[PDB]
Amino acid sequence: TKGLVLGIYSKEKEEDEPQFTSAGENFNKLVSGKLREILNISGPPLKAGKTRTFYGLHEDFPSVVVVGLGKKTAGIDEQENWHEGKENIRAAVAAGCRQIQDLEIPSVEVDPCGDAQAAAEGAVLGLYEYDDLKQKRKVVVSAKLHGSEDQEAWQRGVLFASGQNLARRLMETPANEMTPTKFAEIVEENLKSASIKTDVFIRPKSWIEEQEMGSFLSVAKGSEEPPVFLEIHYKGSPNASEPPLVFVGKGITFDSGGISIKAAANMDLMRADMGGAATICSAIVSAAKLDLPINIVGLAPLCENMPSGKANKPGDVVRARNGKTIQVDNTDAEGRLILADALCYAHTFNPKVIINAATLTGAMDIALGSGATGVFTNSSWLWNKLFEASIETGDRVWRMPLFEHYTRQVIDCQLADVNNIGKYRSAGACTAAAFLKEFVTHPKWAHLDIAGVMTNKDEVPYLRKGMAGRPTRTLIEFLFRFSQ
């Protein structure tokens, strides 16, 4: 019927016993001390992220899962660059919800754990699973707030987590279903449901040609799947003329590498090479849901990178919208090609800031793995804003260098103005970033290389194995704070 998730903290030195949250304390009282009694009988105390289940304590809650929240006053961890208490809550609540789901319980009430937004994030991110294409599926669990005192915060958590889950769905869906057109249609419907103060333009190939986006076009042509340039507007500012914030995302729905073909092992994960587009578009959907008082534009060039008799050939020179020529030495360095055109187009909006996201390089994965998203930016103010937002969400960012040292290695080009792969194999994420900078003149630009945080195995406790949708929540938080 109905399950209940309650939290308990680690015992502090002067306490005689570990303390329940307010809800746990109230429930124990409701059952005349039976919860504390049974917890004591069960043995060792619950530590952070651990769970234990007690049956039959109340007729309304046949299964009660108690979860360890760790130290009650855990705040910002100076060494980890995140709010520890929030992370403990997300992990603990996710673990509790997965136990409720294993017991095949369709609905669960969740203890706010002193921070309803974090509790909601743990439950909603934790229960998520992409199973539309399977016969065998786990029970669908409906999680709601236990109590009625922390509603806005709980709902805020549901909203943030839902945005990330939308990104996860888009990334996880196989490329034959999640084509450029399909991705555009799903984003279009989600944005329109979020707010009527939106406009969506799924720009066709003819428009792309009119816009002289030769770099983007060169990538798309190898495949039979039609390319599209998704342009979305959210008019949240009270002043329609207020300069917008522009987000740009790499939308390669499937990357085979092209003529510079990839190895077979785990190439299926490349269905998520559109993660950059997924995260920035989902962030905008969420911003619209929150009705943030700001104008935002989202740009996402979308296409496949396939080998064929029409595909990009190593050595080919293409002309970007801005007139710059690019020597395509490696057709698998295609994300930067489509981004060159989208970044150029972004300047036409005279934006306040330009932020792009892309599952750009394997080098980024070798550099930081799934620990944090690499951020390249010409603005310390912007770096700081993204960094502060990440401490709150727990979806960490780490700064990477934008030095001429790297630029020199990409403009040293045999046939053109810029080469699409560096002179050497070193610092691949840095030279890719340098390539992108040659198409940016804006003073507040940030490039997020999310290749290393594309998937999750078990690193983030509250995300099941699969595409991660990171760092969608950090982007939403940045926008929220920016709007305030």
Establish whether 170 is an annotated binding residue: yes
CB under 5 to 8 A by kind: which of a copy of itself, Zn ion, none does 441 bind? none
The closest of 110, 100, 63, 71 to 87, measured between CA atoms, is 71
Between 325 and 379, whose beta carbon lies closer to a copy of itself? 379
In the complex, minimum distance from the CB of residue 405 to a copy of itself, in angstroms, rounded to a whole number: 5
The closest of 248, 254, 244 to 229, measured between CA atoms, is 248
Cβ atoms of 227 and 301 within 8 Å: the answer is yes
In the complex, minimum distance from the CB of residue 453 to a copy of itself, in angstroms, rounded to a whole number: 10
Between 83 and 182, whose beta carbon lies closer to Zn ion? 182
In the complex, minimum distance from the CB of residue 271 to Zn ion, in angstroms, rounded to a whole number: 4
Task: Just list the catalytic residues.
Answer: 262, 336
Cβ atoms of 109 and 145 within 8 Å: the answer is yes
Establish whether 102 is an annotated binding residue: no
Tell me the Ramachandran region of residue 371: left when phi exceeds 0, alpha when psi lies from -120 to 50, beta otherwise: alpha
Give the span between the Cα atoms of 377 and 392, in whole angstroms: 20
For residue 407, what are its two tokens? 């630029």
Would you count residue 367 as binding a copy of itself (CB under 8 A)?
yes
Give the span between the Cα atoms of 29 and 23, in whole angstroms: 10
Using CB under 8 A, pick the residue from 293, 403, 415, 481 that binds a copy of itself: 403
Site for a copy of itself in 237-256 (CB under 8 A): none
The binding site for Zn ion (CB under 5 A) comprises 173, 178, 252, 255, 271, 273, 332, 334-335
Segment interacting with a copy of itself, rule: CB under 8 A, options 122-130, 221-229, 262-270, 367-375: 367-375
CB under 5 to 8 A by kind: which of a copy of itself, Zn ion, none does 401 bind? a copy of itself
Residue 382's CB is within 10 A of a number of other CB atoms, namely 19
Between 271 and 447, whose beta carbon lies closer to Zn ion? 271
Tell me the Ramachandran region of residue 369: left when phi exceeds 0, alpha when psi lies from -120 to 50, beta otherwise: left
Give the span between the Cα atoms of 480 and 284, in whole angstroms: 11
Residue 199's CB is within 10 A of a number of other CB atoms, namely 12
- Angle, CA 124 vertex, CA 177 and CA 142 arms, to 5°: 95
The set of residues, in sequence order, having a beta carbon less than 8 Å from that of 40 and lying 6+ positions away, is none
Cβ atoms of 315 and 407 within 8 Å: the answer is no
Site for a copy of itself in 178-217 (CB under 8 A): none
DSSP, residue by residue, 73-103: T--EETTTTEEHHHHHHHHHHHHHHHHHHHT
Establish whether 250 is an annotated binding residue: yes
Kindly provide the residue ranges of all beta strands, DSSP E only, lying in 33-158, ordered along the sequence: 51-58, 61-68, 76-77, 82-83, 107-110, 142-145
Please state the separation of Cα 461 from the chain's center in Å. 15
Using CB under 8 A, pick the residue from 33, 75, 174, 401 that binds a copy of itself: 401
Task: List the x/- string, 144-183, binding to a copy of itself by CB under 8 A.
Answer: ----------------------------------------
CB under 5 to 8 A by kind: which of Zn ion, a copy of itself, none does 252 bind? Zn ion
Establish whether 273 is an annotated binding residue: yes
Between 245 and 450, whose beta carbon lies closer to Zn ion? 450
CB under 5 to 8 A by kind: which of a copy of itself, Zn ion, none does 173 bind? Zn ion
The per-type count for the chain, helices as H runs and strands as E runs, is 15, 21
In the complex, minimum distance from the CB of residue 195 to Zn ion, in angstroms, rounded to a whole number: 25
Q: What residue spans of 394-450 are helical by DSSP H? A: 404-411, 428-437
3-class DSSP assignment, residue 175: coil
Establish whether 332 is an annotated binding residue: yes
Cβ atoms of 429 and 363 within 8 Å: the answer is yes
For residue 447, what are its two tokens? 């490039």
Between 92 and 367, whose beta carbon lies closer to a copy of itself? 367
Site for a copy of itself in 422-481 (CB under 8 A): 424-431, 452, 457, 459
3-class DSSP assignment, residue 6: strand
- Give, in order, the Cα–Cα distances in Å from 154 to each of 119, 293, 392, 470: 7, 21, 16, 21
Establish whether 449 is an annotated binding residue: no
In the complex, minimum distance from the CB of residue 318 to Zn ion, in angstroms, rounded to a whole number: 15
In the complex, minimum distance from the CB of residue 336 to a copy of itself, in angstroms, rounded to a whole number: 17
**Residue type at 251?**
G
Task: List the x/- string, 51-80, binding to a copy of itself by CB under 8 A.
Answer: ---------------------------xxx
Establish whether 271 is an annotated binding residue: yes
Task: List the x/- string, 368-387, binding to a copy of itself by CB under 8 A.
Answer: xxxxx-----x-x-------
Establish whether 260 is an annotated binding residue: yes
Give the span between the Cα atoms of 148 and 146, in whole angstroms: 7
In the complex, minimum distance from the CB of residue 133 to Zn ion, in angstroms, rounded to a whole number: 12
Using CB under 8 A, pick the residue from 29, 405, 465, 481 that binds a copy of itself: 405
Establish whether 291 is an annotated binding residue: no
Feature table: binding site for Mg(2+): 255, 332, 334
The binding site for a copy of itself (CB under 8 A) comprises 78-80, 363, 365-372, 378, 380, 398-406, 408, 424-431, 452, 457, 459
Feature table: binding site for substrate: 250, 255, 260, 262, 273, 332
Feature table: binding site for Zn(2+): 170-171, 173, 250, 255, 271, 273, 332, 334
